[model samples]
Target: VNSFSGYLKLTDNVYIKNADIVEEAKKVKPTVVVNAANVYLKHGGGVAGALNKATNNAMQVESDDYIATNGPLKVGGSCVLSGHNLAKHCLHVVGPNVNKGEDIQLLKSAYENFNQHEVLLAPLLSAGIFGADPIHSLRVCVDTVRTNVYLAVFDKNLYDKLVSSFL
Candidate 1:
């Protein structure tokens, strides 16, 4: 793992930290952990898998069961699931896939819907398999956050870009 670490304040309540996001989410005790997901709410891979593993796979069961019970999210929609974990809840959002030639508007549409819930713990959404550029995704994450949000980013390249936005 790279030791690269940096921080930038978007506001008193919004900032980005380059670290293990799953670990950071665990440290926060009780906050909503954001999952950058598909409409199916699959927690099997990428950030979703990491979170599922961190929460001891209870998060996976709850999310999978959620879809089975409630159905998939609409494109650019979100839902919240509760389970036994370090988190108070898990907030799952669907981003447009770049592989399908979808663009940031849909991802932005997915992101701009903020919860009334005050604190959000998130990764660099859509920059993984969903395929948005990390550098631009940071801006949407920053712009969309209206409450206390700690964006825990794990990639040093993404971290450097995130940190660069403030300079």
Candidate 2:
């Protein structure tokens, strides 16, 4: 397993880890891994890009099918990809392009919509390419999970910020 710089338990059901998102997700082996995608199903950058790379572009293919059938995935909406090699499945949620403090509610909505029983691993949505505040995004993720949540943090600075906010 890849070493993590740090980790914190936010609650009985929530955890934060400072490590490469993909590596940490693999180690945790959650039933579902979550990624941030756009309305167009573009997995071009940030966590989306990494997930795309990890899944051998299978995510992109799934995204295309989802869009073709269900119409565009609106902000605060989500879709799932299954039979993935990394985890049992993946959840793709629509996060905002940037943090305006307004997107937190949308993120919360997306999390609530998951409605699954498996262990879930998610990235700090909007924090990377979307430039959302790490603290706010972390809070939204923690506040929404009904089951165990494993959040992967790739940046040391963001991880530190998340820890400081909780302390």
Candidate 3:
């Protein structure tokens, strides 16, 4: 449902988000699910991740074994057990800001989750809106995953562009 003041284009397919991530899972009974953040603003990594996956097969999760990052998982690094959402396995990538505004907390939480070898995913710092500094964004994301994050923008075009411009 589009949040345009009740102007909703409910498609034949129903998409339930932020709906008790766990309970929804019990209701859907999905096999594998991907939950990359849905925010479209250039600042939101979820938007970039979604676009990246859609545009390039590199990030797209077509297999039943793969999962995608969705929203902030505050349930203590618990995997999405509900199936009522759109995707399957329900991989929740918290991005670089997983800890809200506390950088230390973010790092700690990231370590806790990645330490378990959960899903391979990261925030799209390259596409962040808080300053078009792709290099910094890329570097932070790399640093985040170098010790924990699963993956970031792996698009050849994006990489080539970054190298051509920065290097």
Candidate 4:
């Protein structure tokens, strides 16, 4: 008989299936939190499967889904954002940042329609990347997920005296 470690090292969004996100949202004084945002994995096969799964789970918001690309429609589903952002919304964004300045615009458009208030869910940094040291890599992912939330939510205008800001 072969025996392996009983623990499962969950990657990004693994706990989504466990309803961790929903539970945290239910808390009384929760500020920043983490959830497995796994829209891409819902479908074991393809985009359609993924979409159907997300719909079934109510984990994805179609109102927040958007796709931006550089070229015309293609036959495949891969996009530049695949490496930087995970598809967690009903609409998978396919922005093609082939040009130097397209990424910022792509992300800006995504948040614009959502009022920049919708929770921007993504995988931990380096979670899906190739690694030299697995242990250290895992920690990087954990830390990144915890910190990046602030970057996406804080008001940058407040830092500039020239820009009038109030909330």
Candidate 5:
């Protein structure tokens, strides 16, 4: 999931964006740049990692404090914290872990969490280690947005699939 460019419509204000999410976060400065993360909010790698480094690790400090205060988020749960150097906030979402027998409903739950924000930047949810089907997650993503969404897809193939599937 490492190569790409930019946009297509998904009706209303939703768009499929083939770009680097972290860079896009800096550019659009959306309400939130999403971290399809673990329940613990660890910024060890991926979107979270890039966001962490960009924020000069302030995001990580905030996440640690949040976890210390509320314990970890439940699977398919979420929270928001200062985006610091980039967007207004960073939305940390815990999608279903297929390894734990968690299903699509929970993945769908993650989408619902995004609706709380008027504008969002998101990666393909639960599609990597968490094991959700990209097409299915894309469906939930396109279907769940009530305001604005920048579905930041980085892979050429996935972006092609999104174009073929949605177009």
Candidate 6:
């Protein structure tokens, strides 16, 4: 049921993907799936919101637990939760919040803290909702990683563009 499809390597142990993250997550069955969240750890908007809903709000509930106990998540930090319809763990990393004067550092922190996983699936941190440049974010993902990483891109054209530019 699985095919030896091709992929583009962005860096050692890091890759770019041009497919549905949920489908890719199922195929890889990664240990953790990272999603972008704000300092508030509210999975109410952007990729966080969608992922939370997809996971039946498991991420939100986990976020709530983290917040209620530990205050707002600092930019560059992460909270891991039990996943529902995807991987075993859903990692919510605090990303750049333009409203809070955050920058690429937020993305850097998110990528830097990704740990204890044989395989991890992450989106373009701080790129969409936080307005960070996609190229810069991709660069950070490629630079700050110590485990196998997959940067999931839903748009094939965007994925191709990133792969071509980075390569």
Q: Which is the leading candidate under lDDT?
A: 5
lDDT of 1 at 3: 24
Off by over 4 Å in 3: 1-88, 96-112, 118-133, 146-157, 164-167
Summarize candidate 2's per-residue lDDT along 8-111 as a digit string, tens digits.
Answer: 77897778888787886666566788887777888898888887888899878988887788889878877777727767877887766664444556767767
Candidate 3's TM-score: 0.34
Rate residue 130 of model 2 by lDDT.
80
For every candidate, C-alpha RMSD to the true structure in Å: 4.2, 3.3, 15.5, 15.9, 4.0, 2.6
Candidate 3, 1-167: lDDT as tens digits:
12212111112211112232223223443353333332221212444344334324333333223333443344324343322233344444333443344232333343344334433233333134323345554444334433223223334565455445542
By summed lDDT, which 10 consecutive residues of candidate 4 come out lowest?
A: 123-132
* C-alpha lDDT score of every prediction, in listed order: 0.73, 0.75, 0.34, 0.25, 0.79, 0.75
- Model 4 lDDT tens row, 98-129: 23232322332322222222333321211111
User: Poorest 10 consecutive residues of model 3 by lDDT?
Assistant: 1-10
Supply the global lDDT for candidate 5: 0.79
Clashing pairs in 1: none
Q: Write the per-residue lDDT of candidate 5 for residues 1-167, one digit (tens) a residue.
A: 21223567778866787777888878877767888788888887766777788888888899999989999898878988887878788888888877678877987788889889877788878876667787888888777768677788777788888789874
lDDT of 4: 0.25
Q: With candidate 4 superimposed using the best TM-score fit, by how many Å does residue 95's alpha carbon deviate from the native? A: 18
| Candidate 1 residue lDDT tens string, 41-61 | 778888887878887888777
Q: Each model's TM-score, in the order given?
A: 0.86, 0.85, 0.34, 0.23, 0.88, 0.86
Better of 3 and 4 by lDDT: 3
* Candidate 6 segments exceeding 4 Å error: 1-6
Poorly placed runs, candidate 5 (over 4 Å): 1-6
